[PDB]
Amino acid sequence: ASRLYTLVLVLQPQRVLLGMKKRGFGAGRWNGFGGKVQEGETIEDGARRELQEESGLTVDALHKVGQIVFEFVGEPELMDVHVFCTDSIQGTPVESDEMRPCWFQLDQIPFKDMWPDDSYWFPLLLQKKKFHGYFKFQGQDTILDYTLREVDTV
Numbered sequence: 001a002s003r004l005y006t007l008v009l010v011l012q013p014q015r016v017l018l019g020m021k022k023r024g025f026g027a028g029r030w031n032g033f034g035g036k037v038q039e040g041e042t043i044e045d046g047a048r049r050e051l052q053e054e055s056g057l058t059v060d061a062l063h064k065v066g067q068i069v070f071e072f073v074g075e076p077e078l079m080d081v082h083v084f085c086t087d088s089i090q091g092t093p094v095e096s097d098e099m100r101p102c103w104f105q106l107d108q109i110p111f112k113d114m115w116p117d118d119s120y121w122f123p124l125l126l127q128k129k130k131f132h133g134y135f136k137f138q139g140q141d142t143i144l145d146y147t148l149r150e151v152d153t154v
């Protein structure tokens with residue numbers, strides 16, 4: 001049993017957009033934009049919805065780039081995160097109640113202030129490789145097990 005989540009990375013030739021999560025799960029960490037997928041919407045619809053809610057941005061096309069499954073010790077539901085990237089965005093990002101957006105140069109990604117798993121799979125995203133990952137967490141800071149592979153179909 002798993003629950004569906006989205007994650008959107010706006011990746012342009014020299015920069016990537018991240019948001020500082022201001023409240024809730026993962027507050028205090030930079031991340032892409034996203035959240036739970038709702039009943040009645042497709043995964044990609046939910047990714048666009050969360051991007052708009054969290055940054056005001058809309059997008060022409062979202063591309064599937066990864067899937068990451070998370071186990072949190074003691075939590076019954078696996079988190080199934082579908083990761084999307086886009087290069088063309090519509091609008092200028094603006095702060096929301098959940099997210100403070102900032103562009104980062106591709107050699108200045110703030111890994112120490114991101115989810116620890118990003119350090120493993122974010123390079124593959126920047127290298128335009130598609131990937132499947134699995135990370136088992138104890139709490140929010142400690143990776144106990146993980147797998148990571150490149151795939152041809154996300």
Ligand SMILES: CNc1cc(N2CCN(C3COC3)CC2)nc(N)n1
Pocket residue numbers: 005006007025026031032034035036070079081115117118137
């Ligand atoms: C547990 N490791 C994670 C999890 C994660 N997501 C889970 C939570 N999710 C939504 C819950 O509100 C945002 C955002 C993506 N993103 C990243 N980069 N790493």
